[PDB]
Design a protein around this ligand. Structure first.
Ligand SMILES: *[C@@H]1O[C@H](CO)[C@@H](O)[C@H](O)[C@H]1NC(C)=O
Lengths: 215, 235
């Protein structure tokens, strides 16, 4: 039994109605559908059990509905403390238990294009036999952003890692940091290190690059 | 007031045996109506919730099949404590491990219980990090600003807090005097098992010749304090 949630992200304001979808690969009875809320740095919180029953302390706005294959967590109108990640779960008569991938409800705001920056490996790090190249995406919205590393004539895969901050408390934007990590011997084999950034706010993909050794 | 407190070593080398313990408070192992389900659920960094195993009121055990037989869940009924053991840990087994209380009615003469078919009580979780590294202070390298890190009149600079273990580190700028426009990113778990994060800040380009910028890094597990001057690269 596979649970597929949609959409991946819900951008709303307080007062708006949130309708989170949970689809199962097979027909499941309402008794076996649970919903959970999770905020950063906290254990998940049970919201709905048996498809529609609100857990103890869950406010009125959180309601559940649906049957067969389609189930829904509906918040009548969002309150400021409803922005979090929500998971649906299959709580059947016996294990195994499966969760959906989740749905994140963030704060809606106007589109902000990121500022893109690229940082070469420092001389201190190169002297230890490693080269890290950092690409920075600063204060953008929405969260959906595409970062592609290109080194000379090769798109990079399997040698970078991403990290995104929480939605800012002041301007409700996101920031991302991508680190391309290579061995010093491999790093000195190439010259053009580029970071291509696709986002809703940029008229076209913005590329920030530098040439190794050059200036 | 049902409470679940967790302890156990969360820092393990490769292939070692994870050993976590969960102590039940406010409730019996079986419950008043033989409906209690004691589960272990983990959450790898950045991903969702993954079920691992369960022991019910009858002490029957069911495990996640994808983990093969590497998981064993037992209970010390005299202490009301559940233990989770995972054998031959990999870097993939690095996650926060939650002790969770579930419920499923089993007695036909009994009323439907609260949170039936629901995980209503969760422990605070125990962070588990699998790695071969020992406690190591980070190497703080500069993310030096240049003509390749300027958007309009704004320059970007920062520090790369790389190759430390375990979590966490704290980063500040100019002893906390610089906070506006600062972004310290959550660390990523490298393939080597070490950690690495970046802390950046956007500033007016002209301030690069009139203001010093220092990232204050503090890794308490290793008692490592590093102050790194980040200077603009001219070329
Ligand atoms: C891995 O093993 C080495 C050598 O036994 C030890 O120094 C190091 O602390 C171990 N790592 C962890 C996380 O226990």
């Amino acid at each position: 039994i596979v649970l597929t949630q949609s959409p991946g992200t819900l951008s709303l304001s307080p007062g708006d109605r949130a309708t989170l979808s949970c689809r199962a690969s097979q027909t499941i009875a309402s008794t076996y559908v649970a919903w959970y809320q999770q905020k950063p740095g906290q254990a998940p919180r049970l919201l709905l059990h048996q498809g529609y029953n609100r857990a103890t302390g869950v406010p009125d706005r959180f309601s559940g509905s649906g049957s067969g294959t389609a189930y829904s967590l509906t918040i009548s109108s969002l309150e400021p403390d409803d922005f979090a990640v929500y998971y649906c779960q299959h709580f059947g008569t016996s294990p195994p238990y499966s969760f959906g991938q989740g749905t994140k409800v963030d704060i809606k705001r106007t589109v902000a294009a990121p500022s893109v920056f690229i940082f070469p490996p420092s001389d201190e790090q190169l002297k230890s036999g490693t080269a890290s190249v950092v690409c920075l995406l600063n204060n953008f919205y929405p969260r959906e952003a595409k970062v592609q590393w290109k080194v000379d004539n090769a798109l990079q895969s399997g040698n970078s890692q991403e990290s995104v901050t929480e939605q800012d408390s002041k301007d409700s934007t996101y920031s991302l940091s991508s680190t391309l990590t290579l061995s010093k011997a491999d790093y000195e084999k190439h010259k053009v290190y580029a970071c291509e950034v696709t986002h809703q706010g940029l008229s076209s993909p913005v590329t920030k690059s530098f040439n190794r050794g050059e200036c | 007031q049902v409470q679940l407190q967790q302890w156990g070593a969360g820092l393990l080398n490769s292939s070692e045996t994870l050993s976590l313990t969960c102590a039940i408070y406010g409730e019996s192992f079986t419950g008043s109506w033989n409906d209690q389900l004691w589960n272990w659920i983990r959450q790898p960094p950045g991903k969702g919730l993954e079920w691992i195993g369960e022991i019910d009121h009858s002490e029957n055990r069911r495990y996640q099949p994808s983990l093969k037989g590497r998981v064993t869940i037992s209970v010390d009924r005299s202490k009301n404590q559940i233990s989770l053991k995972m054998r031959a840990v990999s870097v993939a087994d690095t996650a926060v491990y939650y002790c969770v209380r579930g419920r499923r009615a089993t007695q036909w003469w009994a009323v439907e219980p609260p949170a039936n078919y629901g995980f209503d009580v969760w422990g605070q979780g125990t962070p588990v990090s699998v790695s071969s590294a020992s406690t190591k202070g980070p190497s703080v390298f500069p993310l030096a600003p240049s003509s390749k890190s300027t958007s309009g009149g704004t320059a970007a600079l920062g520090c790369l807090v790389k190759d430390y273990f375990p979590e966490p580190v704290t980063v500040s700028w100019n002893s906390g005097a610089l906070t506006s426009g600062v972004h310290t990113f959550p660390a990523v778990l490298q393939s080597s098992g070490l950690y690495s994060l970046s802390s950046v800040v956007t500033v007016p380009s002209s301030s690069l010749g009139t203001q010093t910028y220092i990232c204050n890094v503090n890794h308490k597990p290793s008692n490592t304090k590093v102050d790194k001057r980040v200077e603009p690269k001219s070329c």
